[PDB]
Amino acid sequence: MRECISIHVGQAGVQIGNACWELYCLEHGIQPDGQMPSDKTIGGGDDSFNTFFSETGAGKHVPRAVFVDLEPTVIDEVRTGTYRQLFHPEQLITGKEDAANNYARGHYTIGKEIIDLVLDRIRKLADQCTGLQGFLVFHSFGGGTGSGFTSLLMERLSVDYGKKSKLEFSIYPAPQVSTAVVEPYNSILTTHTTLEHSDCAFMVDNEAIYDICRRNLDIERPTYTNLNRLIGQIVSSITASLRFDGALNVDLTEFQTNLVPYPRIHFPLATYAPVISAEKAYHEQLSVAEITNACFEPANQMVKCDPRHGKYMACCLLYRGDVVPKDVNAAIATIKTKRTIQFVDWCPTGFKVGINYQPPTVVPGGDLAKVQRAVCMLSNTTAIAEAWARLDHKFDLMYAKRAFVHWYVGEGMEEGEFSEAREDMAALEKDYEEVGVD
Amino acid sequence: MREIVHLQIGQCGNQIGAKFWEVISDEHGIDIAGNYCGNASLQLERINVYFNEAYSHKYVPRSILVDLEPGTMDSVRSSKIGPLFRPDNFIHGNSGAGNNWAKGHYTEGAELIENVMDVVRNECESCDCLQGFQLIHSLGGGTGSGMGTLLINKIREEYPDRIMNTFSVVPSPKVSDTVVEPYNAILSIHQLIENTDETFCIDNEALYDICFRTLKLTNPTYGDLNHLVSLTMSGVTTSLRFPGQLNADLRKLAVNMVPFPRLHFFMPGFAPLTARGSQQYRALSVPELTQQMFDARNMMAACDPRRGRYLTVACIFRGRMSTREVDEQLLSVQTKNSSYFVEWIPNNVKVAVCDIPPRGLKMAATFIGNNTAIQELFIRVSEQFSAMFRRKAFLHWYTGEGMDEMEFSEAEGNTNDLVSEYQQYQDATA
Ligand SMILES: COc1ccc(C[C@@H]2NC(=O)/C=C/C[C@@H]([C@H](C)[C@H]3O[C@@H]3c3ccccc3)OC(=O)[C@H](CC(C)C)OC(=O)C(C)(C)CNC2=O)cc1Cl
């Protein structure tokens, strides 16, 4: 009755989604060939992981995934890896020419020659689903494909699936691991284009994942594998309310109502406490109050910004593992006695705690340690305006002398689209300030 | 799978390209018979950009060796790399252009464009996907400069959606005694401004300076200069030849490095630059490589980067080094010397580490920079052009081939406008 179609646009989206589907199969116990030991005894669907894993007649749990790139490298990497038979070859779309870290290439010239094939695969996956809620678009703000083709896809899915709500798991650019210089340009342009076409966007920057990996997993050179494993853990326990039993956030509409008051203020911030290295596995344990405090720690967020200078709007605390609901309320009361967390001047509800008793599973061979108590804090705040202000500051710095603009006007775009996207992000900054001023 | 079509025009382009393909085949573990003989699987990955894989593991390069004289083809075939190249891809005319840009751009170049475009289309038709074109030539001579810019214009006409990368060797009075090399250099620079997307300005003056001061050579031959350019051109395309973080596959390199459509002249450099037979006595580590990477004495264009601002940097390190120390040293260089980088292009220094070093060196550091100091090179060539043009020396050899006298003034005005644009983006502050 509820079905979701995960879309992975770009290299970042494809790699993050491959790690995410690996962790989904690990959490649900699904074998890499597609069969299931335990829950294939029934042989039927609608067991709350039929939102993501479609079941065929042979018992194979093929995921509801569409992997898109304009470059066939990472698609062949997932076509060669351990889940090569789990994903259908029709749903793994490759390309010939890249978008070359250009928004206008992936939105107007190179992405326009492949958009109908991806729309055809999306409709082919949607025709199998009878209760489809929407899509989870995995992409990146910086790259060419993951910005331009994601914006084109969001326009097409809004004009074709207008009764559906589309989540996003975007990758905010980091200067520590950056493939290009024009990542502010692509980021501002795809944020302006997917503001009217996205319903709840979970942007996560690689700078916060970089800092968390370096300060917790003790890797001074974090590769893309460690970042992929950590963001796969983050997104997997984001979606753990959706693939499991019903306490809260059981639907994309529930995601849009519990956190998102405005059509334009739709950028929550996730926070995860038990990010511990695999060597420090049996050193100690972690109580509920301290992991709630670390979920309110500003250095543990998925976005490098400070929430104490802004005002909250919502908090969906999502607990994993064997967590008793008694001391969670004591943790809530100790958080509430701290007046650093300051909600808006409407009826603010509070920390909507839901508890899933399934223990969290980490990847064997990964740097993340296996833990018994895990917690995800989805919070809507006005602290994301700092990240958008950083992006618009870099945009203004590069656009003051119109640097790199000829790479965009030469691929079909207009000159005034940059000023239009700058004005739209200025309006988003003004909206976040108007919520922030009371 | 993307693929670059390599073109070598002229004596200098053919000799530098022969040395370059020798160093590339040594780095990739390919012998002269076209068979792989390396011990690493990283060398075989991304081999399709430069080497055409024929049947039964035969790695022939996609090099189109072009001249107007067969002597350079005979000299290439006299070396070991003659059997390595495709014998159908050798093109030579009957007589050379003879240091005349007009004779290599209007008559002999025009009569050889149809054959070289037939060979270009023959290489292009078998492509699963074309990435772009790589050209090695010299701006001083006649066939190299003139037929290089004519082939650039014809390739831009036939494939306007493909990138164009040139390795243009700017002539010097300290290495060649021909007088009209400012004419060919300035006319080719005027063509390269308007018809190319990427240009690696290699200067023979800077190579002579490095071989004179650093390498302690009293009489630097063409072999030492070609060894230096072969080292730098091998290190520059280590992003194209190997997978990495900063992949920079031609169009991505042009998107990163070129902010303005005429300011596409790069300033290549190589930090452990040593003469042949003496590279085994060099101590190699990270911060000495970074402090030699940005040295004006070490850099391969006759410019002072301390007098300009780096618009975009692409530092690619080569060898077995810790990337934490490399990134720490480069952020220390960017922060401690923040007056030498532009403030209106944030995070303009891109660092990559490739674990495969060039042979003979354990650690290497190749630097690509869109510095503003290349206007000193263009000022030097334009001032030699003005000194040879204000009293019209040897203009009858150019106007006798159908060239108008307005074309020289148009080339001078275009190079002076490029110098003015470089000075404007140097003096501007955010
Ligand atoms: C500062 O901002 C905030 C302050 C507090 C909160 C807490 C948050 N407040 C809201 O969600 C306000 C929602 C407006 C309506 C909107 C107007 C409905 O037409 C939407 C609709 C939805 C589904 C189907 C048809 C129509 O949604 C609801 O009634 C949802 C629908 C449930 C049953 C799925 O139910 C709830 O509210 C829950 C899930 C039981 C509890 N929710 C809350 O405590 C959130 C924010 Cl962002």
Ligand SMILES: Nc1nc2c(ncn2[C@@H]2O[C@H](COP(=O)(O)OP(=O)(O)OP(=O)(O)O)[C@@H](O)[C@H]2O)c(=O)[nH]1
């Ligand atoms: N966390 C994480 N980020 C990634 C990964 N791969 C790429 N990125 C991010 O992706 C951003 C740029 O996008 P690209 O990697 O070039 O992918 P793209 O959107 O397809 O762009 P093109 O390949 O040029 O078409 C960089 O800023 C990286 O931060 C990954 O595996 N994990």
Ligand SMILES: Nc1nc2c(ncn2[C@@H]2O[C@H](COP(=O)(O)OP(=O)(O)O)[C@@H](O)[C@H]2O)c(=O)[nH]1
């Ligand atoms: N660095 C370098 N420059 C060279 C070499 N050979 C020639 N040159 C330069 O390139 C120009 C020669 O151009 P060339 O191809 O011979 O044109 P042509 O005279 O018409 O045949 C001269 O200005 C030389 O300064 C070389 O081996 N190395």
